[PDB]
Design a protein around this ligand. Sequence first.
Ligand SMILES: Cc1cc2nc3c(=O)[nH]c(=O)nc-3n(C[C@H](O)[C@H](O)[C@H](O)COP(=O)(O)OP(=O)(O)OC[C@H]3O[C@@H](n4cnc5c(N)ncnc54)[C@H](O)[C@@H]3O)c2cc1C
Length: 423
Amino acid sequence: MERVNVVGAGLAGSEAAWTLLRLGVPVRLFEMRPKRMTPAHGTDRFAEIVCSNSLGGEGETNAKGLLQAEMRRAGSLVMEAADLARVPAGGALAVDREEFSGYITERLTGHPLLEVVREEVREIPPGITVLATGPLTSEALAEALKRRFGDHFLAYYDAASPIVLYESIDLTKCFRAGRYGQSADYLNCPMTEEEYRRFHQALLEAQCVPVEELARRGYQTLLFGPMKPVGLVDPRTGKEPFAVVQLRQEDKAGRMWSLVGFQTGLKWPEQKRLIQMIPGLENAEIVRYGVMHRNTYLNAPRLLGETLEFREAEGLYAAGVLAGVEGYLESAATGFLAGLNAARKALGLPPVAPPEESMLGGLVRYLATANPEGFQPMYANWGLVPPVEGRMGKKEKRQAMYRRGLEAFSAWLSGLNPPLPRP
Ligand SMILES: Cc1cc2nc3c(=O)[nH]c(=O)nc-3n(C[C@H](O)[C@H](O)[C@H](O)COP(=O)(O)OP(=O)(O)OC[C@H]3O[C@@H](n4cnc5c(N)ncnc54)[C@H](O)[C@@H]3O)c2cc1C
């Protein structure tokens, strides 16, 4: 019909291309490597794994585990490669990285419907196009995306604060409120002077400014910063608290709230330790840890639909880190969806999206509808899907969520018209 462009042959680009091919749609796959390398890549292989060889935990209480199962059910090339290249790593799905990318490279390159172009794409290609250029998207394409969609809707670094599950918050210790300049819908966690003092020092021991760097500059620094109580009034004392930690709603459904101004580079167990010191958050469940690093991505809530098609550019898609996710598997899975919808478009069919119970479904809903102001990248986590009701233990609830999501995803796949062929 029409040959579809896929820009970038990483995790997301490789899966997109494959999905197009599986549906008999011809692909033009651009990859600048090796003509131009990124600071993190060392080969010219498709889907090169640049760091850890882990695709995440595979257990039935792990959100990444559910996403693995969905992609396996979908006949994903990345999962096929991963299962073949698997090496023992207790708990996690880990791979021999060269075998993995070699297998993926061979399968794609040897497909007759696939044409590979070894060039840096400097402008958005016309026609039906999937952009999947990753955290180290070439500067020229990044600037082309800004020119086309707006210079505040692409970032070159993230600065993400920890996000906690709302249902894990002890709300008796908080209050909704804003100060002048703020929306009245922040959650506030008040601290006494002694509570702040101990918090500040634990932060020293834990080691757009990273929050720990502010502590390091002194006791007063945080208080002048993101923990300033000015303009707030505790309705439990009728007074302005000594200090506060504010939380803001991140997802449309309200299951996920971030700590305001808590961008951080602390190790994950240190973040957990620190957050559980905050009144209201003592047994809060962190579902997305804070990070700050070089990372090119689009503001998905301002730009994309749940289908991963650009809302204001028909037949254009983003996948992977560029689309606002984080993680090898998350990149591949959004690659799959974007490739599926791009293929459908080429075939004159309307777009689809997985259900909200599935991890991929929960993930793309979040990309499309999360809080757009200061949007940060998201990885798979249980905050993304509806909870299971009950008084049974956490592990049992999560197992149920896993089973319900994989079942919803499988039914969705089965309903596909046209269907994806068996692997
Ligand atoms: C240093 C580092 C460490 C990471 N560690 C982990 C980790 O431990 N675990 C984890 O889950 N994830 C990790 N990631 C995060 C992320 O999940 C991976 O980067 C993942 O590969 C993202 O998939 P992707 O397809 O979106 O991007 P990529 O896999 O990077 O694919 C993008 C491709 O597009 C190409 N490209 C870029 N610009 C152009 C252009 N203009 N024209 C043509 N081609 C272009 C690139 O050469 C690249 O091949 C890490 C990332 C980095 C940078």
